[PDB]
Design a protein around this ligand. Sequence first.
Ligand SMILES: Nc1ncnc2c1ncn2[C@@H]1O[C@H](C[C@@H](N)CC[C@H](N)C(=O)O)[C@@H](O)[C@H]1O
Ligand SMILES: Nc1ncnc2c1ncn2[C@@H]1O[C@H](C[C@@H](N)CC[C@H](N)C(=O)O)[C@@H](O)[C@H]1O
Lengths: 170, 173
Amino acid sequence: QSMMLDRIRVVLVNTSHPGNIGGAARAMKNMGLSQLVLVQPESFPHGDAVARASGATDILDAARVVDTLEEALSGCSVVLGTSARDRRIPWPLLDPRECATTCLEHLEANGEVALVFGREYAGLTNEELQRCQFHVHIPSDPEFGSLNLAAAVQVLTYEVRMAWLAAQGK
Amino acid sequence: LYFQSMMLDRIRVVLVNTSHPGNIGGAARAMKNMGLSQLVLVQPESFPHGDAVARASGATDILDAARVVDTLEEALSGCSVVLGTSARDRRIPWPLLDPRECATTCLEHLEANGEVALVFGREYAGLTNEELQRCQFHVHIPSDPEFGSLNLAAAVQVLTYEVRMAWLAAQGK
Ligand SMILES: Nc1ncnc2c1ncn2[C@@H]1O[C@H](C[C@@H](N)CC[C@H](N)C(=O)O)[C@@H](O)[C@H]1O
Ligand SMILES: Nc1ncnc2c1ncn2[C@@H]1O[C@H](C[C@@H](N)CC[C@H](N)C(=O)O)[C@@H](O)[C@H]1O
């Protein structure tokens, strides 16, 4: 199919900087994704989000704003949460590529995937992470492993697109 | 072992005529997150600047060590190989590598103390035909054809991320 990417929900939890929402929206659009969900964002709507969303204001316009992570994950068949610190057994830890493979398996099965991203400052709570079935870590310099929020979104969606293309022989 | 990590230092990130200083800071952070250190800026419109420092949270060291130059030729001096980036994956000039092939070509070239430059363009205009001609390889990140180009910092992040992924795999991870 090609409407597969529309079944990927990008969930941003309690975003502090509105420019990161715009940046995430742009990263999404560049990769073929459209469904953005915001859980209690600090400031939204906001000019800085629009500013950073060059060519992707439509995503921001269609964004769902909710009060809880539970509400954000409603209807999903699989939830993958991002972690920049590291592993919690028994939850499996995957890299961006493995994340992409799982996403497409679920999409091909006609499921709904959710990709969860945390706060710039604190990330995701343990409680939030536990609502996920898989955890995803972007390999990085251990002394400086925290990527900008929108940049993390870009890496994941990129891998997702790469996996989707390959599944098509592209 | 240890000089494995030193390989990444030999990868020069070149930003050509950057308009928004936030993008310079974003690029620097993306580089640092991936283990890269060397930033070269060709005629930035505004630098140094506060937005760059802010965007480069924790990666100010890269900004500090950045070299600012008048020409691309200057920027590439001492490099071994040059890879350029193209937002368009249109057919007419010079066959394109994806980020993965790009990561591999970059690593192969780090052999025998080689120096590699990764070149990025202007937020609106990209790289000129002349600038691209200075590149031996041209890289395109696959993206939705119907829509736009990636933000400049986001593009630096994808390429540097692929470089780290290849570099890690080569070590057994
Ligand atoms: N290396 C990474 N792997 C996976 N996600 C990351 C990574 N770096 C940043 N992110 C994402 O970016 C969001 C915002 C980060 N700045 C938060 C970092 C926070 N200190 C943490 O411990 O995760 C994180 O919650 C993740 O969603
Ligand atoms: N899909 C992509 N593939 C390779 N590089 C990209 C891609 N998207 C953005 N970039 C990089 O980010 C820079 C700035 C872009 N926003 C410029 C887009 C411009 N309209 C063009 O067609 O070049 C480009 O010069 C590239 O360095």
